[PDB]
Design a protein around this ligand. Structure first.
Ligand code: CAC
Ligand code: CAC
Ligand code: CAC
Ligand code: CAC
Ligand code: MG
Ligand code: MG
Ligand code: MG
Ligand code: MG
Ligand code: ZN
Ligand code: ZN
Ligand code: ZN
Ligand code: ZN
Ligand code: ZN
Ligand code: ZN
Ligand code: ZN
Ligand code: ZN
Lengths: 360, 360, 360, 360
């Protein structure tokens, strides 16, 4: 089979690999819709999680089952599935301790395009498939559902980590697709006033459609002073960090009230240290809790989030700015995320099969 | 002054009372907008919380300050305020351990029309005024803000007690005004599918506008069976009880998954015992958590919820089905709550003063 | 092989069964140390969870691995293990949402002697062995470690469900071996004063050694009145239920403060309904939270609790009042749990093998 | 009256001040037992929380009521009280939001020797006295209880912030008196293995008496490598930071597992930034939660912690290494904390009065 792979830090290329073996609990899956992620750009070109050889890239897919292991009981060949970016080993220590996304070690539930061949190939492998794949609801388009795999779950996790409460004033820093889903998540956790902070302008407007009330432009003054002015010096109740760099945490601490939460979901691609300012952190004692976490995954997470689409309560289509057909175009799509043109949010790649609707 | 009072179990009438005394931390307030509550109905006619004589009724008000104590620092004469139904003693033991609504004993933060003269009088008393009174935002109509005092905060509290998570399937039992607010609260905590259980048709359309997806009418049969059918036997994730009686808890237990929460905010007006069925409660071990709580109050709770009106994220006007003018009309309004026409959600009474815009 | 089985309601006896089949993730285990439980007593003689025929009893074992499946990676033949009473299916829905003890449905992680052949046989089966079996630390006697399987973990779980905070005054109702472990768990969650409710005198001294401060015997009168007197009417902060019957919950409600938690871990053997008194439950609004939960299990739970024995912080040996040798003596041991001499806390049965120290 | 005051950053001296006025909710209190704190050394000589003029120092006291305001209902003249270092304004926004220690702003519940005249004077003032003073139990020595005001509550808060669970392996970094109470707190929250990390050796031994199992000497190698070696590379479950500097956080992150908590209570006296290492923080995603908080205070906190002394479950006497008599000796005692001799943990100063036992 063909797949698009990382060939050591700094290089991608198409390669041929055998089809993965399918153990008793596993499933093999062919992609129907795929998206590329900014995370793969940090991983390939910044070496942000270390070196990899012949690793198929990608971790956002809707797919169709082409094989199941002997002990798979909930899935059959031909089933269409939402594939979560995180596919935990559910019996590992960290899963039993409430952190399945770190199953087998830090970030270990994130397999696809972390250390496991991902979804940018003709067939890919899923561990604990009964546990890790949700059936695609008949009322959701494959491209809408591909946004669940990572963008919705990660953005929403930012808002979960920020411990957002009913009527909270929230600031979301970074308004790419994960940030837009952090705004939506905060809205769905009951935030009132929501400040969206972008480098851009263009897609801070879409943030208003997901529940943002106030847009803050970096290219204007210091965002902290802008935020303190808008709040009459009081600051915000909670902060989600969904973009930026290692220096964004200091801004969050400076704009937030004492007794609060900062929820980071940004994959930090470079920099030795994240600096937290001693004074504005209440000299160690301000209860400004700092969290940084990898998204949940598995079937239940996808099922719960999918219900928001099915019930008309979340529109993920707004994130899709560019559409391609054919497995080859995942290369083109990943290069867009590397080069970041103006009107880009997320590309999606659809793949057609002649037995798409008849495979069994 | 005049006020409408409970004159022992089964009787109300107007009485004259002295204007209450104002201590250093207290405020005296006059009503600008008032609403009656079915709670006063249980208290008066069912004797649900014991006998009372000459206790002024009502605990839902937007008001205007007429006097402040010498130690009140945030408020002044003429300020217009949202009065929470619950006005805790914030330094009491129960407050220090995170339950201010029980300040000084069980239900002790619910003063107005529980054991303290309520808001249905020309002047009423607020303890710890700086802590307990939120300023009325200029962008909210008094009639909409009076829904914050109890309806919004109580219905939202049901959703909070039910521990609603993103994408959960929720059942709200009872769709009076509290119930509609439990649907809204559930929606604002991120619920997907939401079953609303009631019989009235307009309640069962406003509920859809607040985020209900599914309407369950008992006339179509046993509501548990209905819910189990609709969820292909798995049941719902979380339940909010916002109406019904002591037997509603068994229904909740029977329709909910193991590892779940039942959030009750219904004031139970009669019956010796709430029956929990042993087998369906997992013979003691089902992790079907049962919560029954009085609403939060105080200014912060009002400020936070008011922000949802100010930001366009909550429309409390849908709750108002009857409008009156003049203080004396709180009697007619309360009688609506007792006689219960199918026209009814919430009445509001508007009261004007010659110096409503000039008092200072 | 032979095993001691429930032969329908009201009868036990020895039977021959095939050695169970071992799948890729499973392990077969032989008992080194066994204990009987009053739970099997309710199951057999009261029919508390329905009828069963030819189901092998017991769910408390230290064991030795005799076979592993092809996909078992952490265990090998001859390894000695602590077997949790609860052995979840970790990838099931309920596990993914944080309730692995209900994997596959309510009580579904409690397999042994609920619906799956238990540990009272020459060989028994463990699903998801790598996840579910902890290695026996070399510094713990098998007889002490067998208390971890259910007694420690269940009693500690009562304390966890009761939401015990530093310095809380706690009442533990029922001071059998689970109850003594609820006292210990409460002590290990930082409780100060701890009332232990029972009638037996030695239970009411071991309880003092585990952190009880106050012993309450019903023979001195109504236990609620006793507790209210002892707390000058304010009542207790938190209650753990570890014994009694369906009527114990009302006692708990009556003796506890508003804004509190009642943590039940008692397996209720009979009765249609658990009665919660309306007035004392704050007419629905007292924030007296009611929790009823099956113990956690799996290896991590066993590892964590075992660490408390290894570090000198928990002495489970005090629980053991009767010691037997040989597998057949699990019958005598279970009959002790049924006939209930005042001598009794927990029996343990030790089973030896010629190759106990050489099997590999 | 005389008091020991901060006279601008860098200077202390004895000054004369009038006795404070006593408002309706206030109490005036004379000291019976006092302790100095390392925090006052950062505040005076490092200027760590800004400049102050004529501010009486100290915030650890047991005292006796000499005057009460007209609305004080729970205290009378002559009552002996445990005075918490934190005396919140319980109705302020932050208190209503669950953070009373930040009442009126970050650190605002910490009044004594933060910005309010403290306890090192013949008479001092307490706001909201009914809420903020606990009666001294008859079974606790004044000097034992002085350790509750700050040392026990802060150390225990470190363990609370570290989210310690039953059987957790914990590392406590910094083993001064706050650290020794963090070890005790972790023990009282159910930790198993506990590593105590000191610069010293002498009072790492006392740490074993409070539940530490392993001592780690800074003067030996890198504490992170020591800890990873002792845990077979697995690291610890939770970390409490109770001493050190801005660089201690990086050590905590490097020794802790993914999916975990670091609870800081160290008042950080200098340094612009606290550095968190990007890589070992899981490049933003390791769920290594970082918390830093000021202790709770008020009466209930003191009452709960005092119960641990009364019940024989906490011995605070072990912290007292030096004893003085007379109000003047608080100067001597504070200089010990500045200069830090070898065998010092905490000094205590007792003050005798001829009507100590007769004042009314
Ligand atoms: C699976 As990810 C770290 O790109 O959100
Ligand atoms: C203050 As109420 C019990 O009527 O919601
Ligand atoms: C596994 As059990 C209900 O006997 O503690
Ligand atoms: C009151 As303190 C910051 O010295 O623990
Ligand atoms: Mg707000
Ligand atoms: Mg005028
Ligand atoms: Mg451990
Ligand atoms: Mg051999
Ligand atoms: Zn390489
Ligand atoms: Zn991604
Ligand atoms: Zn009467
Ligand atoms: Zn009401
Ligand atoms: Zn039968
Ligand atoms: Zn058992
Ligand atoms: Zn100065
Ligand atoms: Zn201090």
């Amino acid at each position: 089979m063909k797949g698009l792979a990382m060939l050591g830090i700094g290089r991608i290329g198409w390669i041929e690999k055998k089809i993965p073996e399918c153990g008793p609990l596993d499933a093999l899956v062919r992609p129907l819709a795929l998206a590329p992620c900014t995370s793969d750009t940090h991983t390939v070109w910044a070496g942000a999680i270390g070196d990899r050889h012949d690793m198929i890239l990608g971790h956002e897919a809707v797919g169709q089952i082409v094989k199941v292991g002997s002990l798979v009981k909930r899935l059959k060949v031909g089933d269409k599935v939402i594939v979560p970016a995180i596919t935990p080993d559910w019996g590992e220590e960290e899963s039993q301790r409430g952190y399945p996304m770190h199953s087998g070690g830090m970030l270990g539930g994130w397999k696809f395009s972390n250390f496991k061949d991902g979804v940018f190939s003709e067939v890919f492998h899923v561990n604990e498939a009964d546990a890790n794949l949700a059936l695609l609801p008949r009322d959701i388009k494959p491209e809408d559902a591909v946004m669940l795999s990572d963008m919705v779950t990660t953005g929403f996790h930012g808002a979960e980590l920020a411990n957002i409460k009913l009527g909270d004033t929230v600031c979301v820093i970074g308004i790419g697709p994960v940030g837009l889903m952090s705004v939506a998540g905060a809205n769905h956790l009951g935030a009132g006033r929501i400040f969206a902070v972008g480098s851009r302008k263009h897609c801070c407007d879409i943030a208003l459609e997901y529940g943002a009330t106030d847009i803050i432009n970096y290219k204007n003054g210091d965002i902290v002073e802008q935020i303190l002015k808008a709040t009459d010096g009081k600051g915000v109740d909670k902060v989600v960090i969904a973009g930026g760099d290692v220096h964004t945490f200091a801004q969050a601490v400076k704009m937030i009230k004492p007794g609060s939460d900062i929820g980071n979901v940004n994959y930090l691609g470079e920099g030795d240290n994240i600096d937290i300012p001693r004074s504005e952190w209440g000299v160690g004692m301000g209860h400004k809790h700092i969290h940084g976490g990898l998204t949940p995954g598995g079937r239940v997470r996808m099922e719960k989030l999918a219900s928001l689409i099915s019930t008309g309560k979340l529109d993920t289509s707004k994130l899709i700015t560019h559409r391609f057909e054919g497995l080859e175009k995942v290369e083109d799509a990943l290069m867009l995320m590397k080069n970041k043109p103006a009107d880009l949010i997320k590309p999606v790649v659809r793949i057609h099969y002649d037995d798409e609707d008849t495979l069994h």
